[PDB]
Paper text:
Here we characterize a metal-dependent, bifunctional [name] from the leaf beetle [name] by structural and functional analyses. [name] in [name] ([name], EC 2.5.1.1) produces FPP in the presence of [name]+, but preferably forms GPP when exposed to the heavy metal ions (HMIs) Co2+ or Mn2+. Inter- and intramolecular cooperative effects in the homodimer strongly depend on the provided metal ions and regulate the biosynthetic flux of terpene precursors to either biological defence or physiological development. Strikingly, a unique chain length determination domain adapts to form geranyl or farnesyl pyrophosphate by altering enzyme symmetry and ligand affinity between both subunits.
To obtain a symmetric complex with IPPHAl in both subunits, a strong ligand for the Al site like [name] is required. This inhibitor significantly increases the thermal stability of all [name] variants apart from D319A, which prevents coordination of [name]+B. The protonated imidazole group of ZOLAl imitates the nascent carbocation of DMAPPAl, while the central hydroxymethyl group constrains the bisphosphonate to a fixed conformation. With four negative charges, bisphosphonate resembles the eclipsed PPAl moiety and engages with all metal sites to induce IPPHAl binding in its native orientation. Thus, the binding strength of C5 ligands at the Al site correlates with the affinity for IPPHAl and promotes catalysis in both subunits. However, the enforced closed state through ZOLAl coordination does not provide information about the metal-dependent interplay between the Al and HAl sites.
Author numbering:
A (entry chain B), B (entry chain A): 85 to 429
The structure:
Amino acid sequence: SFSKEESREFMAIFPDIVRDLTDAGRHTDIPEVTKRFAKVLQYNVPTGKKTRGLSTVIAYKMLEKPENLTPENVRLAGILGWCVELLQASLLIMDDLMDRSETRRGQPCWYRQENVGFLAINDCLHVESSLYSVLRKYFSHLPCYVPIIELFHDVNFKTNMGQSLDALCMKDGRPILSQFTMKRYSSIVKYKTSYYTFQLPVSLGMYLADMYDPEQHRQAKTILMEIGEFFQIQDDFLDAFGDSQVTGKVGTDIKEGKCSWLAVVALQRSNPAQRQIMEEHYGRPEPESTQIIKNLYIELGLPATFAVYEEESFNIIRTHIHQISKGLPHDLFFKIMKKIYKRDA
Amino acid sequence: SFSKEESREFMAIFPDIVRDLTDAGRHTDIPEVTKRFAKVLQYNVPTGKKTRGLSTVIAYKMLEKPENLTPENVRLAGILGWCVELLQASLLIMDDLMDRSETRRGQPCWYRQENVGFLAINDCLHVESSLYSVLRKYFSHLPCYVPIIELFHDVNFKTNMGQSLDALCMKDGRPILSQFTMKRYSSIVKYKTSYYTFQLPVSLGMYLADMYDPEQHRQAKTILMEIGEFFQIQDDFLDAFGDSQVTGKVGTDIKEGKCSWLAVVALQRSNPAQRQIMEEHYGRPEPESTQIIKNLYIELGLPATFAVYEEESFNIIRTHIHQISKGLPHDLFFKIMKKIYKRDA
Ligand SMILES: O=P(O)(O)C(O)(Cn1ccnc1)P(=O)(O)O
Ligand SMILES: O=P(O)(O)C(O)(Cn1ccnc1)P(=O)(O)O
Ligand SMILES: C=C(C)CCOP(=O)(O)OP(=O)(O)O
Ligand SMILES: C=C(C)CCOP(=O)(O)OP(=O)(O)O
Ligand SMILES: [Mg+2]
Ligand SMILES: [Mg+2]
Ligand SMILES: [Mg+2]
Ligand SMILES: [Mg+2]
Ligand SMILES: [Mg+2]
Ligand SMILES: [Mg+2]
């Protein structure tokens, strides 16, 4: 899975989605806006790695009865995966505005383009609303239609709650370091990342396979939230220690005063002098201050701590998969974990 | 219609909407965020005129069979009206960021308030998503559920297209005055205002009354698009000439270079010297340029021009209402026009 041919099949759907949203004989009185929206979609939607959309297809293929897999049902699963990518695209447009970011996917953040600015808020809302038009076109005659619409709206609401908890790291221009606990961290990640990134693809595949039992969705959730916590911890590590040419994004968490995994572990490990460095220099726009924090992270050994976590967490999650209900395919969870951890074994 | 008793009935539902979204035994691990969202709702949702929500109820009462007007079905119509008010609240949060506005509904705009700022961007999305949670709680077992959610999806998408066309007034910091025609103006207002403000309340009332005839919906739409353009022309007059203590908002259209009705009519009426004033001073950040344009609008007699237009258009719209058939109650459309004609807020 996550093969070159699966990517080919998935990518082939995107031009049809753009046609559905911008050139299907609708809104023929406002071609200026529809032609612009095609450019919004081209810049912002297909420019990532598509792990969430591809995972929606893989989940469906592993949950559906083999006999029921047809080219037509697999294409439906691919359309659902593009609906997840429309949600991702929307969330990153708004996130980059909120985080004052420079680059995304190796190009300027959308809001930084000429004649965009705060119009990016509208483009964010427009890209998310688009997915419900796609759902109506392709799924309106199936039993899974309403549960899928409701899952997208509920996951959006949850993601908004997580984005708000993430944003509340700062008050009056200074970080609330005494509240930067691992408990707070885990709550932020659950809501701002794990539901939409990991739960949504798998629950979509379950619904398209006519699996409505809330206990099956809950058994999946326990594993998927553990994978999501690693995924966001890795993101946080790379914000400070990654190469922006490889990640496609310039880090901002130290300047923005975020309750990142690095900040939480730094506060756990700091002696009183190091805690005073955090108090003085964390969450400041001055470049000296951001470099002083990075130097503290190096002094505290946080890169080795992250490398240990990447190894240990893989093995803990693999053990937990073994304990999932016999009713769910254990190999779906192993495949997701292997892709996220960039391991074949 | 728009009576004290109808207002009391409608406001009585608001505390239950807040409870539904923030205190219904959900998300009990993140009370910081749920308590803050209760404040977001309190500030941003209920302090406007509530004409859209009240119109949803009036439409339902005038479309349903009298024998079916139970406490419970009238309450459902009020809940649908609050869902339109949630959509409105979401749009205004974003709009005030995009328009760089100072006040809304008599208070500083949400994004300007202490420790809000760019958090207002997530709050806008969160308020929008919340209306679908309310629809799910109350409507999910009723035949109107899918038509209602599909209508909200479609109206959202159309509103985003209008907000985009509205924003394309300026390119590289100068207004595209050669393109400020009445044809452009009518297209902008149809999409950014008329669908969500007038079509949505009346179509919701129809759906709750189990009225699905595509031809009845189309005849209501035709008149409601005329009403929406009239209403937006009034809004544009208030931006330049309203009393901000009565309207609750300080105008920005001249500074933001908007294709307002006043700008379109100023370009139609201007001599060559007056056109050069528009070219030089429209859509500038400098207070002195905006005052030059306001003074041009005064000298052109745009207040009296608006007054004559509003009276002429009220009479044309009422002539068109008299021509409505398809079993639609003329008095619903007359009551909407009576409520807005000659408004100062
Ligand atoms: O660090 P963030 O949460 O802002 C991020 O991971 C985006 N995001 C937003 C919600 N969940 C994740 P990115 O580093 O891509 O800017
Ligand atoms: O003039 P706008 O369109 O920005 C406005 O009417 C808001 N709006 C946004 C879309 N439709 C209407 P407001 O004057 O309330 O700021
Ligand atoms: C939740 C996080 C870490 C946001 C970035 O997600 P990805 O790294 O999957 O981004 P794209 O491939 O879509 O660019
Ligand atoms: C579409 C428009 C003109 C936006 C403002 O609507 P209202 O003037 O109805 O504002 P509130 O009563 O909701 O504050
Ligand atoms: Mg970010
Ligand atoms: Mg962020
Ligand atoms: Mg990050
Ligand atoms: Mg505005
Ligand atoms: Mg506006
Ligand atoms: Mg206005």
